[PDB]
Amino acid sequence: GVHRVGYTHPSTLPVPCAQRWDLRLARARIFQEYIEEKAPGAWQLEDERSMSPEFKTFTGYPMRDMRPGYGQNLPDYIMKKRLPNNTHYELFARRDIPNEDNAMYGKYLYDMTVHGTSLPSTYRMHKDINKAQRNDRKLSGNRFKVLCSSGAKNPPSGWEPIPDA
Amino acid sequence: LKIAKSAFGFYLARRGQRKYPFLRRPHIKNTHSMNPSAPYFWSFMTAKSQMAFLPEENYITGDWTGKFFVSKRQVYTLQHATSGAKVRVKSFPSIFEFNSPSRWNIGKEMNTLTKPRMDLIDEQMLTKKQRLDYVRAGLLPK
Amino acid sequence: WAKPKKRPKVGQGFHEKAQKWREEYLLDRHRALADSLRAYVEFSTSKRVEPWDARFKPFDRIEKDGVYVLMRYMMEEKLQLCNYHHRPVKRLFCNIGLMGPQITTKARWKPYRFATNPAGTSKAERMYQRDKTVYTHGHND
Amino acid sequence: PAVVDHDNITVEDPNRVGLNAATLDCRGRIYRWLRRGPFFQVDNYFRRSVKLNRDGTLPTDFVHEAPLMRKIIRLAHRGHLKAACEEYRRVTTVPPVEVYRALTACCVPGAKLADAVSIFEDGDSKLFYVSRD
Amino acid sequence: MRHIGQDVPKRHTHFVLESRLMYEKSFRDCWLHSVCRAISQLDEPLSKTVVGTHQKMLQRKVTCFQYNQYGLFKTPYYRLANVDRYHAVQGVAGTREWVPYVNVSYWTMNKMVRGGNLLVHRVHYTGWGTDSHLKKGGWEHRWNKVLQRNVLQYSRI
Amino acid sequence: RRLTSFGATPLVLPLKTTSAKDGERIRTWEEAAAILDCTVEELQQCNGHAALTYQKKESETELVAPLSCWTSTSESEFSPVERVHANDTLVAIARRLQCSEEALRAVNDGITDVSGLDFVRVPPEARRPRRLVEPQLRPQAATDALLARTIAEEETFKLKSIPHLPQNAERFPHEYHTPTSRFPPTPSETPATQDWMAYTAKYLDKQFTISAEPAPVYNVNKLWP
RNA sequence: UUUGAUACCAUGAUAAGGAUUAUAAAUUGAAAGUGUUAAUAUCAUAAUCAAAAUUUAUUAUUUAUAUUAAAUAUGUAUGUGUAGAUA
Ligand SMILES: [Mg+2]
Ligand SMILES: [Mg+2]
């Protein structure tokens, strides 16, 4: 039925008694509770699937609310929502990275403490060793590529590269 | 991919015609974004509420030198028509300009004013094979 | 997995063609929109065939008895105000209450596309004779 | 050494203090950032400002925070313990001894001991022992 | 740079690092973003104390503030790319080409499981598994039970 | 009877005869800030009008003190008056407020039967009074201290109202859905509809004697739970 | 004072694909290899953080009582369940 919800103030009753709505406002002050003013009275729908022992999927709690339009957009959804801080997302952010040991310590630090020195990555070492091997037979299939070119283009006052044949 | 239309042609596999979960396809290609509806005109591919504010992209947020094109989720405003200033949008091949201003555009996003897939086809971006396949489907004359 | 062939270059003067084509596709779309709004509203405003399926009850009954009596004397004005559009018609029948639970349960209504025909429709072919130049989603005459 | 200006932050970032993801030499920086301890941001912010002066004086007297400390003291003298504690929250810098005096003095007449104690312990051995008086 | 003295065999592995920073930016911006959203879109009065013209005004003030924040990370998580920390292979999450608890792509999961590197247990390829919960209602049910022990067993205060 | 900090009644500083600085009117900011024992910037936060017009407070009539300067009295804090229940006796009321009954009479003019009264005046002698307003509530001065700049701009730009909806909006029911709105929509009410007797009385048969079906004096919760 | 995994030649490795070890206390999925992985380098920064451009063998869509509300989400093909060929 379409009716006006109504409230009888206890001073007006022929016995004073504590009205359930009044109690509800108490409960809302204590655990601070948003009272949705536009909540339609007609829409009480339990989630049948999870709340009835008749379905194999029965958790005892209302897993989803059955409201078709409801979306991450709405201020109401935003107000009760778990922020991503310190969830698994953070755990992924930190522990899943390309070389897993760089999660535990600075490579240079480790290398310098354990070995006497910084060590190149395995890949780099491969390219290094290969250059040494193939520079020993053929020469001049090569190129000279640096980060900063000035050191080669104007070399120091000394520096007379040994002629090759 | 078979043909590389961008860099990603090299990195990505098609995996045949593969199914993705509902409304998550890796690449957002909105072919439907201009899809005429008189009765749904104000609800389709627009803001879910008319009390929402216009997006970020209708405003100059910081100190700018200038822009090349404005974003396509920008919404066409009476000033877009009236002011007589360049309004560009990035579409393909290059850019679409709103040159001929109309009030009928107002209040919709430029997504909706720019036809993504044109009925027009360049024969010169097509291989002879591809042109054949476009003649089979009854698109290109031959 | 074969190395992807390179895409040929774009075209010469195709940037102009694409600009022009989209430009006047939009200009055309303005009139297509104007016209389909005109159509949509003309449809909302004009009368429709009766929404209920007369082959079932309580509708089959002779037009001088039962539901038709209930309509001629109590509901007529309202049924005409809403132009026999099937949604408000069905709602009015719910609110008249003198039928009550039956509207959805015992009574049958015509399918969507048939119920949308203009009043006076004689042959079924009419569904297919409406204008296709206009974007109303079958809400046009 | 990197230093962040909170007044001058620009998109250009002239001092280049931000953590740029793709620049030359970035990688070890990114890795360092991902290894940082649970309070890193907070601790660094707090220790690079707020430190005992070379004279043995407390950092306690700052021009921009002074009226706030005054307000706290004032509030505590009129016996508003909650309002005072609520202003104590918004203090960026170490509060002067006078604040702690006022605040505990306010705790006395209502017998609040737990509160007097947490006040004291807050100002002491966290904030440089301003509270030990 | 410019492929001079590159340390890793795949250059794109670096993208994975970039991704991490994205999540970091989100942690830095989520609370802020969402508050500004909620206060902006609220049609009902904000409160007893803030109503009417003050509320309208404050709403616009806030969304103006939120638009001004350059670099604030608003991108929804399902639109971020998933890329392997090992071979930098990518996969769509929620698809059989991405494996969620190790967060590696199918390709790497396969490689790592077959040469023993991951410790898993093989179960018949066709069923639901050894697990009770999955055996009952499949993926959705197990999803639910996880919600139940993360949240619902608490009566919050 | 202990008082809560900053009672809900605002301290007002009138201009009046002021200090010996004038003996006529108070004028400068730092002056009133010395009087009320607060920062001048707080004093300015609270008063938007007197801060925008000028700093010499040219023509403006008063100042409002910052919330931290307000003093509560038992008078402003506790309700002077008490509601009377249907069943009430002077004995009952006295027990409720902890008064002695004679003291309750005294302020109420020796009244004996309370049946014709909505409110009985409460003696200052009362142990349990009611507080005028919920104490854990936040005073409005605080929330307005949060918004100070906005409240000054409201006056500068002369903003009476900012319309949330377009002019004709109620005419189109499915078009303007704010994102707080919920389905199914509620129909507007109708006068006699709640039960068959009321309806019959108003619409069908109009000499029907029973205008509504008997209404339990206690509250009936129609949506329940 | 250095030069390869790059847009580029630059070895390895896991897929799919039923054809005769049968009933009892018992599984209807196989090794012969399907982009991403370890010694051949000697043209080039091409990588997603949104809102984007159909030619690709390798894909089970909702078919006539009631039909667009939250991330933006598909305007098109009614034609005698009707060729050939296929699963
Ligand atoms: Mg192979
Ligand atoms: Mg990059």
UniProtKB/TrEMBL annotation, chain A:
Stretches for region Disordered: 132-165
A cellular-component GO term for this protein: mitochondrial small ribosomal subunit
Protein name: Uncharacterized protein
Organism: Trypanosoma brucei brucei (strain 927/4 GUTat10.1)
Automatic annotation (TrEMBL), chain B:
Organism superkingdom: Eukaryota
Cellular component annotations (GO), alphabetically ordered: mitochondrial small ribosomal subunit
Protein name, entry field: Uncharacterized protein
Organism in which the protein naturally occurs: Trypanosoma brucei brucei (strain 927/4 GUTat10.1)
TrEMBL record, chain E:
Gene Ontology CC annotations of this record: kinetoplast; mitochondrial small ribosomal subunit; mitochondrion
Protein name, as recorded: Uncharacterized protein
TrEMBL record, chain F:
Domain LysM: 84-113
GO cellular component: cytoplasm; mitochondrial small ribosomal subunit
Chain coiled-coil ranges: none
Name used for this protein in its record: LysM domain-containing protein
Source organism per UniProt: Trypanosoma brucei brucei (strain 927/4 GUTat10.1)
